[PDB]
Design a protein around this ligand. Structure first.
Ligand code: HEM
Ligand code: HEM
Ligand SMILES: CNCc1cc(C#N)cc(-c2cc(C)cc(N)n2)c1
Ligand SMILES: CNCc1cc(C#N)cc(-c2cc(C)cc(N)n2)c1
Ligand SMILES: C[C@H](O)[C@H](O)[C@H]1CNc2nc(N)[nH]c(=O)c2N1
Ligand SMILES: C[C@H](O)[C@H](O)[C@H]1CNc2nc(N)[nH]c(=O)c2N1
Ligand SMILES: [Cl-]
Ligand SMILES: [Cl-]
Ligand SMILES: [Gd]
Ligand SMILES: [Gd]
Ligand SMILES: [Gd]
Ligand SMILES: [Zn+2]
Lengths: 402, 401
């Protein structure tokens, strides 16, 4: 009943006893595994609140002692009198760190203890959001010395609309169709780009136009917000030795800040809780720039490198991709913007796994997402067996607000 | 029915084939164990019955006289003997289905083109060896490799199993060294010591081909040396890094898995070696660059003048790419069949599309299908996959020692 977990590079073996605590059923059954699917599809609130409060108090070595029981009664009374409860500041903080710590697909969780939590739970109106989001971005960006941060907007309440950020991230590039359907800019954001335009935004022409924000106060159709350009830190992409690479005109932004995910703590739901860290270079260099449905630049870079693109066995794709990742790391470091390569990132994650084995008896890890999209087996996580499961508190995906 | 998305294209299918998943895998709704490497006549009858139904559907004779004849024949043979024998055509179909059903095999576009050698009359370890040598000779085909399987007698009550103790027909020895290191392939230290313990006179090279340890029923394993001219090998050189040849690296032409169990209609063939041809990343990335295998990555990178003192130079990625280039180039030079990971994953995408039409799905183990370098540069990365167990099947089995 305790999954045996082997590391095949070293031969070491552990048991994931933490998996025994998994709440939300995953997508897999004895009959079929659905682990590669990206998205795999009233007093229930007190059981989740009780569980979260007990978590909080064990983590401060204060289980079964005065303040713990007292806090147990106050949430009991709060839900009894109001049908919900409010998180203590320290709990909201602790829950944010735990949701991050529990994110199975996050390779950066060695950082999970260092998280700046901005409490925007007294927020009201999209204008207020924009200043919170702008405080977050400026704090997180910090002139390129990136700092992990989350801003927690008001929780979900019955019978009243949600706070929602319509953009999937706080910084996204536009995607413009043509007299031929095809896209100039980021093809991933064709939808939100067409929403921003349909809500008043004057579209640009370029391949790297920072989209405006669509911020949704409860029961209000959204409002457009132009992000201050001096607040959107971008990195022009150059290559250390390929002088023509800069002339390709590629850029990427500094701050990866996911703004479409729902933070769930102790049964409470925060559909607006944008979190940010810093990039792993393969996210930009491999996925964003080289995915065929993203900027799809692989062949252009290979033409410029004079690679033989006529045969797949020249591994021209592999070479061009590696140089793109080199350009990303070089450019971010030259711009003094925090970035981590997939080798450092995965080695730190192995350290995270070892810590968590000792601290909690295991670690929910989603192999397909932890292993980087290039050089998978050159990283140690490739050879590490992993167990994937849902712990609470958590970041969950949620439907598009339209 | 699971919904399955391709993210490169946007297309969506439903894996209705998974609903027929026979045996159960390791995952539950509580926890996914997809990443783990190694997760009674009545039930023999139902397995047999289902395989016979599969066979008669393949020959467009489902529900016919011959079909029921075979069902009744097998039921009465199981009643009288506890087991039954496959007809030759059923064995051929069952071996191909087992390949077709192998979720971690990216080469399955080829599944219909499989040469089946019926060695079920095999009598001894000496005859087993001859069959194996003929398999290797046929499959290698002077470098124009041909997919093949040799099926040795099935498990049956009252006699031990035929077993090949080697995990592949061609493996390089791994010698634990004077100072705890391994000379050769560290994956093969165990089988190497077994060969020595069974009378083999070791070498001391890094690429010494292992003898075969062949087990006839209720027999100790018997040592058989492969004639060197049967084992086609490829010296490894790089088209533009002339020092690469001086590494003295080699690999063999024929990937021939010999330790897996073939299961057809409830019958078990513990010895049924099968062989195809390599995908270059198995050699270039895993066998040569895994830290626990030949572990040549840093040595190559140092020779390439890469800056190995910092991970962000991507020296590892650069050196691995050139090792893979060297593998492809060397096998092409030698005129030994090889497929690179771009061509293999593109042909696997066609396999999934063919299988969606033919069967309504395809068991695929994403983490094994996605190559170990350049994952998201291949189309399979962006393909969601459903992993499940269909029979006939190749199964792992315990080592016989
Ligand atoms: C500090 C540096 C960080 C790095 C290098 C990092 C890296 C990554 C990467 C590469 C992914 C894969 C996403 C994809 O490829 O689409 C990911 C996912 C994710 N990360 Fe992190 N991240 C960091 C910080 C954070 C923070 C601060 C949070 C929240 C407080 C967080 C929570 C998540 C979540 C929710 C996901 C989605 C996958 C899941 O829900 O399991 N990460 N991260
Ligand atoms: C014809 C060219 C072939 C190619 C290019 C190919 C490719 C591969 C690769 C790359 C793997 C993963 C191995 C690893 O990383 O350890 C694999 C596994 C496997 N292949 Fe194939 N293969 C071929 C032929 C065959 C044949 C002829 C058979 C059997 C009749 C077969 C059955 C299997 C099996 C059983 C596995 C183990 C995975 C599982 O049990 O699901 N393959 N193959
Ligand atoms: C890979 N680019 C899209 C992306 C998707 C998701 C998710 N879910 C998460 C990230 C992300 C988030 C954070 C905090 C850091 C990071 N390096 N990536 C980035
Ligand atoms: C990748 N090196 C080890 C290896 C393990 C297993 C298994 N199971 C299978 C293969 C293999 C087998 C066949 C027939 C072809 C091929 N390219 N690889 C190779
Ligand atoms: C189909 C497949 O599961 C999907 O493309 C996944 C695979 N692994 C991933 N890993 C990361 N880090 N990010 C991703 O978007 C994905 N996508
Ligand atoms: C632990 C991890 O599952 C393991 O290293 C797997 C991952 N995917 C693989 N994929 C292939 N094709 N071959 C392998 O050996 C492995 N190893
Ligand atoms: Cl991103
Ligand atoms: Cl191999
Ligand atoms: Gd030029
Ligand atoms: Gd040269
Ligand atoms: Gd040397
Ligand atoms: Zn699973």
């Amino acid at each position: 009943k305790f999954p045996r977990v082997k590391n095949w590079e070293v031969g070491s073996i552990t048991y994931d006893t933490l998996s025994a605590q998994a709440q939300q059923d995953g997508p897999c059954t004895p009959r079929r595994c659905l682990g590669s699917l990206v998205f795999p599809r009233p007093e229930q609130l007190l059981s989740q609140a009780r569980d979260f409060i007990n978590q909080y108090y064990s983590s401060i070595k204060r289980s079964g002692s005065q303040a713990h029981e007292q806090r147990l009664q106050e949430v009991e009374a709060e839900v009894a009198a109001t049908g919900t409860y409010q998180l203590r500041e320290s709990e909201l903080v602790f829950g944010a760190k735990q949701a991050w710590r529990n994110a199975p697909r996050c390779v950066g969780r060695i950082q999970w203890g260092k998280l700046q939590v901005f409490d925007a739970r007294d927020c009201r109106s999209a204008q207020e959001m924009f200043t919170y989001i702008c405080n977050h971005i400026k704090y997180a960006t910090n002139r390129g010395n990136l700092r992990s941060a989350i801003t927690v907007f008001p929780q979900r309440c019955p019978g009243r609309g949600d706070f929602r950020i319509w953009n999937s991230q706080l910084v996204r590039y536009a995607g413009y169709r043509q007299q031929d359907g095809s896209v100039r800019g980021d093809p991933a954001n064709v939808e939100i780009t067409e929403l921003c335009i349909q809500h008043g935004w004057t579209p640009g022409n370029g391949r790297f136009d920072v989209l405006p924000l669509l911020l949704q106060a409860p029961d209000e159709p959204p409002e457009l917000f132009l992000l201050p350009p001096e607040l959107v830190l971008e990195v022009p992409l150059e290559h250390p030795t390929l002088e023509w690479f800069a002339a390709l005109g590629l850029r990427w932004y500094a701050l990866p800040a996911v703004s479409n995910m729902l933070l769930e703590i102790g049964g409470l739901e925060f559909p607006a809780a944008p979190f940010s860290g810093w990039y792993m270079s393969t996210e930009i260099g491999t996925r964003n720039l080289c995915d065929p449905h993203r900027y799809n630049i692989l062949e252009d870079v290979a033409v410029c490198m004079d690679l033989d693109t006529r045969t797949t066995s020249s591994l021209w794709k592999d070479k061009a991709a590696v140089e793109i990742n080199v350009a990303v790391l070089h450019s971010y470091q030259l711009a003094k913007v925090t970035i981590v390569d997939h080798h450092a990132a995965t080695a730190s994650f192995m350290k995270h796994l070892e810590n968590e084995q000792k601290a909690r008896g295991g670690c929910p890890a989603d192999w397909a997402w932890i292993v980087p999209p290039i050089s998978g087996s050159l990283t140690p996580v490739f050879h590490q067996e992993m167990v994937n499961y849902f712990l609470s508190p958590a970041f969950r995906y949620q439907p598009d607000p339209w």
